[PDB]
Design a protein around this ligand. Structure first.
Ligand code: CA
Ligand code: CA
Ligand code: CA
Ligand code: CL
Lengths: 154, 280, 83
């Protein structure tokens, strides 16, 4: 249960991060924004935040005019890790994200592996990392670190 | 119970990373001293199967440049209708689509991919089309990241999308570099488009053409005009830098399909650009 | 529940160290590595041992234990790499 929520959390994260796309986006008013936006206060996070595009939507009949990509994000809000999901890319500001309260958590720190070194910030417009290291502090578990590959071996 | 599955799916992704590692291996080894990309090379024999504890992987590699790259529409141009637009209208026409609708879609695609927010086509539309939708959004105004982004353009449906899918792609290049050596005979409508004949591909040499000039000067293309040949020369290739990996992974009851786009980085260096779970 | 939680946290260490193997070179993967990772307030020892594969493609086992001497492996993983 405490375990279920953590397992859920890790599941959401793995499914999102491991299918990240090197796709720049248009923001709430159509402004150009980077493929991966990450750092202090991203999505009004109380800690670090991140926002990116991922694929892997399976919709083999392709019945509605929609692509197989989504925009997702993670932040700390009200003492919780929270997942935000938009149902498509480059969404109008009228389009509001779903919000999923995940584990209690109070600090999210991110590092990014560029293919050579680990760096603390990400600033490319088009390119995405090879790997991401996430650290957070959970009142239920303590300090948790996880490394994800974003796009397999290089 | 969920601990086991989550471990196993994690292990299903790691086998996908294993699958990809093998692909990059096979590509480096078969292409190391090779100047071209053709279907008698070792990478093109498949699928390969490997056992894993409680499962297996199946892997198949294909030439990602064996298709019409829609991102050729991102190419800086200064003509009222560039070549990629002409060719796509010709391609779409050949899928039982009336002249009008084929134009609407191609022009809509042009406007969706071109970086400006202004209209320059009779039938194509920019942000207004897309803000008007049930779930409103903006026009990408950049190269497509995935072929699925085309589903959303003006005059598109599921039937046509699925007809178009085997023939067009979204590569991270604005060039049209179609590898004539790897086009399947079934993709022969592409050639029909590009020539304004499965015979050409049916009769392709065992180890492909040495170059595009050799392709273009074969007896079968005697009567085609010089201008068509000069522009075909700008869009065809005998080489490739992009491959698709399909991996089908099984761990106990878990079945996962992964599609990975691989880029050639050096003579013996290939990398995965991105990957996604795909339809079976 | 305690054992499920233990395997879950040891599982994170195993995953983390498998990811890092994909960032290393072929020669580094060919030799045994081991270390220590502090996670969720406990200390987990890990080590990565090459196995011989069929295809001329590397393999490696990843083991995680609560014990410095690696008795009683909580989580094992196997992974394949290019050679
Ligand atoms: Ca335009
Ligand atoms: Ca545009
Ligand atoms: Ca730690
Ligand atoms: Cl770790």
């Amino acid at each position: 249960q405490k375990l279920n929520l953590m397992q859920q959390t890790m599941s959401f994260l793995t499914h999102d991060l491991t299918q990240m796309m090197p796709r720049p986006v248009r923001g709430d008013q159509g402004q150009r924004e980077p493929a991966l936006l990450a750092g202090a206060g991203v999505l009004a996070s109380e800690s670090e935040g991140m926002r990116f595009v991922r694929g892997g939507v399976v919709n083999p009949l392709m019945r509605l005019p929609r692509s197989n990509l989504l925009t997702v994000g993670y932040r700390i809000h009200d003492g919780y890790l929270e997942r935000l999901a938009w149902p498509l890319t480059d969404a109008a500001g009228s389009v509001k994200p779903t919000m999923q309260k995940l584990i209690p958590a109070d600090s999210l720190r991110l590092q990014f592996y560029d293919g050579t070194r680990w760096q603390e910030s990400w600033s490319s417009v088009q390119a995405i990392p090879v790997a991401v290291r996430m650290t957070l502090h959970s009142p239920q578990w303590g300090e948790i670190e996880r490394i994800w590959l974003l796009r397999g071996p290089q | 119970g969920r601990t086991r599955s989550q471990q196993e799916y994690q292990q299903a992704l790691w086998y996908s990373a294993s699958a990809e590692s093998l692909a990059l291996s096979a590509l480096s080894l078969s292409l190391k001293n090779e100047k071209r990309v053709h279907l008698e090379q070792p990478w093109a024999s498949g699928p390969r199967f490997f056992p894993l504890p409680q499962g297996q992987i199946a892997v198949t590699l294909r030439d990602a440049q064996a298709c019409f790259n829609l991102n050729a529409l991102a190419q800086p141009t200064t003509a009222s209708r560039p070549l990629a637009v002409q060719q796509l209208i010709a391609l779409i026409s050949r899928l039982d689509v009336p002249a009008y609708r084929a134009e609407l879609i191609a022009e809509s695609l042009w406007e969706f991919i071109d970086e400006d927010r202004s209209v320059q086509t009779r039938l194509g539309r920019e942000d207004s089309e897309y803000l008007a939708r049930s779930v409103p959004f903006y026009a990408a105004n950049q190269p497509l990241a995935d072929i699925s982004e085309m589903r959303v353009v003006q005059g598109m449906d599921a039937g046509l999308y699925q007809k178009l899918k085997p023939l067009v792609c979204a590569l991270p290049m604005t060039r049209q570099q179609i590898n004539i050596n790897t086009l399947d005979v079934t993709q022969s409508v592409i050639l029909e488009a590009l020539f304004d004949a499965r015979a050409l591909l049916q009769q392709r040499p065992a180890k492909g053409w040495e170059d595009v000039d050799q392709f273009l000067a074969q007896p079968l293309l005697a009567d085609v005009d010089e201008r068509t040949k000069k522009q075909l020369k700008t869009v065809l290739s005998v080489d490739s830098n992009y491959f698709w990996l399909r991996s089908d992974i099984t761990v106990n009851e878990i079945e996962l399909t992964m599609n990975s786009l691989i880029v050639r980085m050096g003579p013996q260096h290939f990398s995965v650009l991105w990957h996604q779970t795909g339809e079976s | 529940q305690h054992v499920l939680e233990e395997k879950t946290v040891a599982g994170w260490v195993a995953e983390n160290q498998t990811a890092l193997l994909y960032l290393m070179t072929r020669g580094q993967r060919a030799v045994r590595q081991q270390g220590e990772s502090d996670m969720a307030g406990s200390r987990w020892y890990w080590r990565t041992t090459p196995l011989s594969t069929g295809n001329a493609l590397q393999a490696v086992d990843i083991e995680v234990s609560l014990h410095e001497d690696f008795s009683s492996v909580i989580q094992s993983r196997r992974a394949w790499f290019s050679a």
